[PDB]
Amino acid sequence: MLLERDLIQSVGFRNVREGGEITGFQFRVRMPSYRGMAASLIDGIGVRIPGLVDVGPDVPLWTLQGQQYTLAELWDGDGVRWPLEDAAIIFVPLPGGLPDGVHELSIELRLRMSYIPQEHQPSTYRVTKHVTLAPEASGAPFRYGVSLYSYMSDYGTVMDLETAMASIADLGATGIEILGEAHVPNYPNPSDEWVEQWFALLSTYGLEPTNMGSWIDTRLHSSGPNGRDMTVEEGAAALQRDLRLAKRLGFRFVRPKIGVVSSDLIPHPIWTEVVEASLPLAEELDVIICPEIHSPTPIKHEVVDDYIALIRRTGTKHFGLLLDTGIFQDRPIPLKPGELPGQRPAFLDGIHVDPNDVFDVIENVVFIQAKFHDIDEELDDKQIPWEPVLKALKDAGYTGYLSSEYEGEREPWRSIEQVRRQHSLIRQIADRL
């Protein structure tokens, strides 16, 4: 598993329970040095959160290689190491723990390097990070998941599958959503080694697969001298291939993204006979087909009414709706540096769907992608009004998943902290209701 560049890691910042009592909190620290060293060279860590915690360097306890020690036990110990590949787990005693939210955590880590003269010793590392506590809030009635699209540029550059899965299980989320054409290696035929390893990681971290994203590329052969349009048989075979891979990996929903033929995102005309050809296969494998309702398409739209008309005409239980919460955005996404207003499309200011419009279509919504762009250190969302949205979902009777979809700036490791802030914000709102 990979770590972050910040010494204080976001994953693992939790409260610690011993016998039903919260006895303190913990967090994980990356080794700042270029090597891992023996644990007796540790000279302590001082932990400070302003207003809540201020402990000295000898107060916290160290979990190194699966065993917890005090600092005096580390000084007399032998054989215990802080490896470079491992993050040290620092337990700070605080009866009752920390409250939910983002905390300004400041550490003062001391290490003894023997090759440095004694006057410049110990080596001191002072970092400050705004870290989000793993949510103590039990956000019933919703279930909580994370889409791997939230780590868009992070996956494959700073993150692999196990590091992403470890971060999802640390939030307390139980679902994981992938894009199948991005996160399944050797698509569409993963090896039997990978599929058995994929099922091992789901039982390790306690995650269940929920949604697999799919595409039906209608402009697959549009370019060239022999440029043509995708037919129904080539289009139905694309969706049927994705339903079999989602059944093979344990997923429950498939979201097909059909190509468009106009500026209003009107779907390609083959979609209604591609989907109806694959509804026999979906009912056999028990996977629900759910196309996405995302901005600039509001709920009161002709495209959305075509999805509801397809369910009543066919009478199927394996077609549903996926709701993207970017349609509820009321404040504009900020301007990228280098552009003036006018050349970006006008739906990036938010289309402002009133959240009471979910009452019309909630009996066909099977899955919700919690789309967001920016949450600051006060747990204030900058684009989505989460409190009237979650109030309308709760009163309409939604009890399914809310998968995080981070859409913000793809700064490296920024998406890890942002998804933590969203689960902390949503679970705190759902307890306030």
Contacts with its own copies, residue ranges (CB under 8 A) = 2-5, 30, 34-38, 40-41, 43, 72, 75-76, 81, 83-85, 112, 114-117, 119, 149, 152-153, 156-158, 160, 179, 181-183, 185-187, 215-224, 226-227, 257-260, 262-263, 265, 268, 412
* DSSP state letters, 156-174: TTTB-HHHHHHHHHHTT--
| CB-CB neighbours of 245 under 10 Å | 20
- Residues near 339 by Cβ (< 8 Å), separated by ≥ 6? none
The interface partner of residue 3, options being its own copies, Mn ion, none and the CB cut-off 5 to 8 Å by kind, is its own copies
Shortest Å distance, C-beta 169 to its own copies: 20
Choose the catalytic residue: 183, 294, 301, 352: 294
Is 294 in the active site? yes
Q: Which stretch binds Mn ion (CB under 5 A): 117-125, 134-142, 165-173, 322-330?
A: 322-330
Q: Going residue by residue from 334 to 373, which x/- string records binding to Mn ion, judged by CB under 5 A?
A: -----------------------------------x----
Has 26 been labeled as part of a binding site? no
- Contact between 148 and 164 (Cβ < 8 Å): yes
Q: Is 417 in the site for Mn ion (CB under 5 A)?
A: no
- Measured distance CA(373)–CA(409) in Å, rounded: 8
- Measured distance CA(429)–CA(386) in Å, rounded: 8
- Measured distance CA(182)–CA(155) in Å, rounded: 10
By beta-carbon proximity to Mn ion, the closer residue of 105 and 365 is: 365
- 369-398 residues near Mn ion, rule: CB under 5 A: 369
Give me the residues paired with residue 53 across strands.
Answer: 49
The interface partner of residue 397, options being Mn ion, its own copies, none and the CB cut-off 5 to 8 Å by kind, is none
Which amino acid would we find at residue 397? G
By beta-carbon proximity to its own copies, the closer residue of 167 and 218 is: 218
By beta-carbon proximity to its own copies, the closer residue of 52 and 84 is: 84
| CB-CB neighbours of 220 under 10 Å | 15
Please report where in the chains the tokens 């709920």 appear, as a residue. 299
By beta-carbon proximity to Mn ion, the closer residue of 152 and 166 is: 152
Shortest Å distance, C-beta 189 to Mn ion: 26
Length of the chain: 433
- Measured distance CA(122)–CA(380) in Å, rounded: 40
Has 369 been labeled as part of a binding site? yes
The interface partner of residue 158, options being its own copies, Mn ion, none and the CB cut-off 5 to 8 Å by kind, is its own copies
The interface partner of residue 257, options being its own copies, Mn ion, none and the CB cut-off 5 to 8 Å by kind, is its own copies
Shortest Å distance, C-beta 60 to its own copies: 16
Q: Is 324 in the site for Mn ion (CB under 5 A)?
A: yes
- Measured distance CA(321)–CA(301) in Å, rounded: 13
CA–CA distances in Å: residue 156 to residues 86, 152, 171, 178, 413: 20, 9, 21, 14, 12
Shortest Å distance, C-beta 380 to its own copies: 27
* DSSP state letters, 66-119: TEEE-HHHHHH--S-EE-TTSPEEEEEE-TT-PPSSEEEEEEEEEE--TTS-GG
The interface partner of residue 354, options being its own copies, Mn ion, none and the CB cut-off 5 to 8 Å by kind, is none
Has 380 been labeled as part of a binding site? no
The interface partner of residue 216, options being its own copies, Mn ion, none and the CB cut-off 5 to 8 Å by kind, is its own copies
Structure tokens at 212: 């697999």
By beta-carbon proximity to its own copies, the closer residue of 35 and 336 is: 35
Has 100 been labeled as part of a binding site? no
Candidates 141, 148, 150, 154; CA nearest to 181 is 148
Q: What positions carry a catalytic annotation?
A: 294
Q: Could you list the residues known to form a binding site, using ranges.
A: 292, 324, 369, 405
Q: Could you list the residues known to form a binding site for Mn(2+), using ranges.
A: 292, 324, 369, 405
